[PDB]
Symmetry: C2
Subunit: 75 residues, 2 copies
């Protein structure tokens, strides 16, 4: 649930140009994985959001020379 989802997420990050993992947090009790993404542009972040949405449950939101994305996955 954690280890296997992490590999999938890392694959999508790695496959997606213009994206880096900035931070990641996991809460066992909520079985929730919170991800903060750095992106070169809004276009790159949308590339990533829809790839993540294709594999997992949900779009990536928020956003803050400096674009960030927030994907809370639940399982």
């Amino acid at each position: 649930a954690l280890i296997s989802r992490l590999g999938a997420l890392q694959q999508i990050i790695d496959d997606t140009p213009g994206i880096r993992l900035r931070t990641l947090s996991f809460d066992a009790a909520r079985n929730a994985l919170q991800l903060e993404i750095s992106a070169v542009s809004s276009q790159a972040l949308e590339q990533f959001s829809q790839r993540a949405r294709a594999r997992f449950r949900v779009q990536t939101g928020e956003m803050k020379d400096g674009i960030e994305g927030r994907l809370t996955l639940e399982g």
Copy 2:
């Protein structure tokens, strides 16, 4: 660094009676993995701390019906 260390950590958690992962956080920039452990007792948390210390760099500290451990790994 993240994916491979996670599997090692999960092995030690799983091998150690009386321990559960409560939360986990990773900061890419510090290449730092923060772990919060729930334990049945101080004895279980010491069992875990020394296993983690054997594989990684550092002892697990803090502590807070409710014992917790904090292992910040750096890589």
